[PDB]
Structure formats: structure tokens, C-alpha cells
């Protein structure tokens, strides 16, 4: 049986190379633009003229990502498996999983011992990797500004007068005499006034309309006068030079500053100050949603949102975990509840971006990244820990139906062996094909006068990319393979293969498909950083089934948990 792996591997290969033959015989018929050999001659300097820069520092994140993880697998397959195959605790027969995964280890061997040292080296593997990848991505400038001083908290009745009277004295300088006129501009920022464009569409209803056009234009002059009198205390000080913002903030964080006639009156006090962004990403229509509402907004929307991944991850769970419940036919409840989490895994940034919209963050610069980081970690939540978590729980539940010295997952690790396999072959195989995108792009095509287009819609399909979520989905994976490289250590083999055909997919897309990015280096920088969490999180893993299995007397758990903290600290 070796867990079901044999059989997963199968259909899952069966499922990839069939959806290659989809690709190869719609490509050029339904698009309308081999690409193997496209994907293993196209050298650097193309894809550097070829789509931007971002995509060379992507590619290059993509190549440290695999020789890591072929370091991880050789030094995984070649030591610690034979260790924990060397164990008479799980169980015997050779075609199982618990021969080859932590289960097959005696609570009082040691080498756990070794299992946490090999812990440890991978995460100083893992930061050196990315360090050369951070060494290798340069350009990490403009962050000047000078315009900066997004002041909030100001009470309503700031009249600018008052304001500009202080900061001569408090701050000195500030010649901008400009600064309140930036409140809730939300009604007023409609981008409803596209009634116009369907207004030169002229739509029975033959032509209908105008009254929205002209209610829309009796509204967007009512806010106009309305901006005024809607004072929500947002202050924005666009500087001359850059020497005087720098010497006002360290002043206004050095606290009271120098006395001026209107301090009292103003309550300078009490004020918040930071630097501000570019006038062009600042959202004024979320500028309105501000203070504690803010904040009820985000715990809300969290709230709603984890109750839609304990509502998502569970179906899987409970299909994984069905035959073992009396205490099964292979190709069911092995390859349905980890197909079903991938479907509801790769529907769910969807959902994060538009809870993220609702959401309604202040900055645009800070809708991509904080975009990407909220998509990792709900993926993480999604199937790495909550599975985990639920699994273990409902296996230890089935042991009570109590020798925690075997308490491990149910089937062991195959579950998550299997989570890397498909998508590994049928996942990767899927987003080459773009199902999704295809149905969409046939829908248009569909969906219209069927005489003026054919011409359109072609043009217009192909969209830059997604460096953030592409960012999130492979750290995902590659946190799921790392935080069972130690234990379990099947799974890097099969996690390197998946990181091998998702480069080559990703090679392909970023120049036979996607248009140029020009996204900001944050992404990739914030991408480095969550590459570290993977080890992390990876021996957070060692020690809690340590802990889970033998008791915090025994040595390895007293070492693992302060090895955990100081590189938490660190």
C-alpha cells in the first residue's frame, strides 16, 4: 500500500500529463498565440528584455528554492530516512508509511536527537539561500519623500489656519498651506460616472438611461460641496525639502514640542504623525473608514473569514479521516479529500482579495503586499496547520477509542505527502492550463453582439500576473514540504519534483502568456522573509509531535523547545 502513495502518484500523473495534452491541442486554437522546447532554451537575457526585471528576481527565487530543496532531499533521503527506518515502533511490514516517517522511532532512541540537529541545520541552509538571493536582488532605494506628514487623529475643527500657525513655531518651517482639504473623499470618488460610457453605448430600451447620468452628476456636485463640512482629522504637509521633514519628525518623536500660540487650541498633544505615500495610491474613497471602526472592520471580516477555512478545511478532514473512524477503496478517500483541498485552496485567494477590498486599507502600495502576506497566511491556515491540527486531534480522539508513545497523524504523513503530489502534477498541470481562465475567456466571446468582436477580448485577456499570490502559493507548498522534510522524510523528493515543474510552468508563463510586471521589490523581499518561516515553522512541528509523543522530562523535547525559542528570537 506504502500509504497510498503508488496509487496517488499514478492518477496524479495520469491527471497531469492528460491535462499537457489539453494544452497542447487548445493552445493555438482557442487563444491563438512546442513551448517545452521554448522552456529550456529560453536563456536569461530573454526573459530579462522579455517581461521586466521582476520576473528575473522572481526566476531567481525560484532557482535558489529548488537547489535548497535538492539539498534538503539529498541530505534527507540519504540520512534520516535510513534513521528512521531503523525502528521497530510503528510497525514492520515494508509497504507502509510508518516505516519510513518519525513514527518508526522508539521514545527513548536517540535520534531525535539527530532529527532536531538536521532541523537546525536546514534553517541555517534555508537562511543562507535566501541571503543569496537578497544579496543578488539590488535596488532597494526611493524611499525619499519628502511631502510625508499624514497626520491623523486631528480634531474636526481644524480650520488650517490654526494648524499652520502652530507647526511655525512646533516644526519649524512648513510652507505648504495645504493640509485638511484631504478628508473622506468617498461619495465624491465615484468611478459610477462609467454610465457614460455606456451612455455612448446608447444600451425595448433602445437607448434608456441619462437619468442615472444626470442624478450621478447632481450627486458628484452635492459631494462637492459636502467635502468641507466632512472633517475626519487627516492632514497631509506635501514639504519643499527633504532636511526639513527629516529634522520635524525626529523634533516631533524627540514629548512636547516647541510651544506655539494655537497648541492649545489644536491639542498637539494627542496627535498621531507618520510618513505618507504617494498622492496617487493614497485611497481617499477607505480614508473615510478610520479609529475603532477600522479596526471592528478588520476583526470582523477575520472573524468571517476564519469560519470559512474551518468550514472549508473540514470536509477533507473528515474524508480523510472517515475509514479509520470503526477502529477503504485507495483510489477514494485519498485522492477526493486532497483534490477537494486543492480546489477550495485554489479558490481561495479570490475570497482573500475580496475580503481584503471590503477590508478597505488606507494605501495601495499596502493592498499588494499586505494582499500576499494575508494569502500565505490563510493558506497556512488552510492546509498546513489547521489539517494538521485536525487530523492529529482526531487521531489521538481514535486512540482514546492511552500509549501517546505512537500518536501521530492518521495514516501518518501521507496525508501531506499526497497534498505535495498533486499539486505537484495535477495542480501544476491545472494552473499551466488555466481553466478558469479559459471558461471566462470563452464566456466573453460568447457573451456579446458576436459581430464586432473576435477582434477584442484577445487583446485584452492577457493581464500582467500575480507575483504576490504566485509568491504565496508557492511558499504554501514549500512550507508544507519543509515542515515535513525531518519528519516524514518522503515528502522532499516529491516536493522538489513539485518545485522543478512549477518553474518550468512558471518559465513558460512569464513569457508565452503573461504580460511585463513592474511590481514593487517589497514583494520579493516579503517573499525572502516568509522563505525563513518554513524551517521555523518546520521545527515548531518537531516539537510538538515530540511533545505530543513523549513528555517535556524527556531530554530531546527539554533541547527542541529552547532551540525553538532562541531562533524564534532570533
Known amino acids: ?65 529548488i537547489f535548497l530543496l535538492v539539498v534538503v532531499s539529498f541530505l534527507s533521503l540519504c540520512v534520516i530516512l535510513p534513521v528512521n527506518l531503523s525502528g521497530d515502533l510503528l510497525d514492520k511490514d515494508p509497504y507502509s508509511f510508518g516505516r519510513t516517517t518519525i513514527a518508526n522511532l522508539q521514545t527513548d532512541n536517540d535520534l531525535l536527537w539527530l532529527h532536531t540537529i538536521f532541523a537546525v541545520i536546514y534553517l541555517f541552509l534555508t537562511v543562507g539561500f535566501m541571503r543569496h538571493h537578497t544579496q543578488s536582488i539590488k535596488y532597494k532605494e526611493e524611499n525619499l519623500v519628502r511631502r510625508t506628514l499624514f497626520i ?12 499652520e500657525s502652530h507647526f511655525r513655531d512646533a516644526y519649524p518651517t512648513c510652507e505648504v498651506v495645504d493640509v485638511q482639504l484631504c478628508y473622506n473623499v468617498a461619495k465624491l470618488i465615484y468611478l459610477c460616472k462609467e454610465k457614460k460610457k455606456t451612455e455612448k453605448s446608447l444600451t425595448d430600451a433602445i437607448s434608456y ?58 491639542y498637539t498633544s494627542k496627535w498621531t504623525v507618520t510618513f505618507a505615500a504617494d498622492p496617487e495610491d493614497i485611497c481617499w474613497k477607505n480614508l473615510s ?27 477533507s478532514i473528515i474524508l480523510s479521516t472517515m475509514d479509520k473512524f470503526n477502529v477503504n477503496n485507495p483510489i477514494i478517500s485519498q485522492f477526493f479529500p486532497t483534490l477537494l483541498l486543492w480546489s477550495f485552496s485554489a479558490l481561495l485567494p479570490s475570497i482573500v482579495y475580496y475580503s481584503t477590498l471590503l477590508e478597505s486599507h488606507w494605501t495601495k502600495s499596502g493592498e499588494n503586499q499586505i494582499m500576499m502576506t494575508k494569502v500565505y497566511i490563510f493558506l497556512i491556515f488552510m492546509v ?47 494552473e499551466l492550463l488555466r481553466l478558469p481562465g479559459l471558461i471566462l475567456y470563452t464566456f466573453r466571446m460568447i457573451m456579446a453582439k458576436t459581430a464586432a468582436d473576435r477582434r477584442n477580448v484577445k487583446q485584452n485577456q492577457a493581464f500582467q500576473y500575480e507575483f504576490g499570490a504566485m509568491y504565496a502559493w508557492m511558499l504554501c507548498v514549500f512550507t508544507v514540504i519543509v515542515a515535513y522534510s525531518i519528519t516524514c522524510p518522503i515528502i522532499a523528493p516529491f516536493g522538489l519534483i513539485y518545485i522543478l515543474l ?38 515548531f512541528w518537531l516539537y510538538f509531535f515530540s511533545f505530543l509523543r513523549l513528555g517535556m522530562k524527556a531530554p530531546a523535547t527539554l533541547f527542541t523547545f529552547l532551540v525553538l525559542l532562541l531562533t524564534i528570537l532570533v
Open 1 to 65: 500500500t506504502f500509504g497510498g502513495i503508488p496509487t496517488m502518484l499514478l492518477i496524479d500523473v495520469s491527471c497531469f500529463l492528460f491535462l499537457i495534452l489539453v494544452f497542447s491541442i487548445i493552445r493555438r486554437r482557442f487563444w491563438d498565440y512546442p513551448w517545452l522546447t521554448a522552456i529550456f532554451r529560453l536563456h536569461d537575457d530573454q526573459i530579462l528584455e522579455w517581461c521586466g526585471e521582476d520576473a528575473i528576481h522572481y526566476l531567481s527565487f525560484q532557482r535558489h528554492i
Open 152 to 163: 491623523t487623529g486631528l480634531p474636526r475643527d481644524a480650520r488650517k489656519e490654526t494648524v
Open 209 to 266: 438611461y441619462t437619468r442615472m447620468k444626470d442624478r450621478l452628476l447632481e450627486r458628484i456636485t452635492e459631494e462637492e460641496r459636502h467635502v468641507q463640512d466632512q472633517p475626519l482629522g487627516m492632514a497631509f504637509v506635501t514639504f519643499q525639502e527633504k532636511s526639513m521633514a527629516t529634522y520635524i519628525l525626529k523634533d516631533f518623536n524627540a514629548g512636547e514640542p516647541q510651544p506655539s500660540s494655537h497648541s492649545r487650541e489644536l
Open 289 to 315: 473608514i478610520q479609529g475603532l471602526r477600522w479596526w471592528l472592520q478588520w476583526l470582523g471580516i477575520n472573524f468571517t473569514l476564519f469560519l470559512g477555512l474551518f468550514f472549508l478545511t473540514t470536509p
Open 384 to 430: 498546513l496547520i489547521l489539517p494538521s491540527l485536525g487530523l492529529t486531534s482526531l487521531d489521538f480522539f481514535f486512540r482514546w477509542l492511552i500509549r501517546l508513545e505512537c500518536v501521530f497523524l492518521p495514516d501518518q504523513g501521507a496525508f501531506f505527502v499526497n497534498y505535495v503530489i498533486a499539486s505537484a502534477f495535477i495542480g501544476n498541470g491545472m
Open 502 to 539: 512549477k518553474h518550468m510552468v512558471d518559465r513558460h508563463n512569464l513569457y508565452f502568456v503573461y504580460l511585463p510586471a513592474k511590481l514593487e521589490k517589497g514583494i520579493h523581499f516579503a517573499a525572502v522573509n516568509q522563505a525563513l518561516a518554513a524551517p521555523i515553522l518546520c521545527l
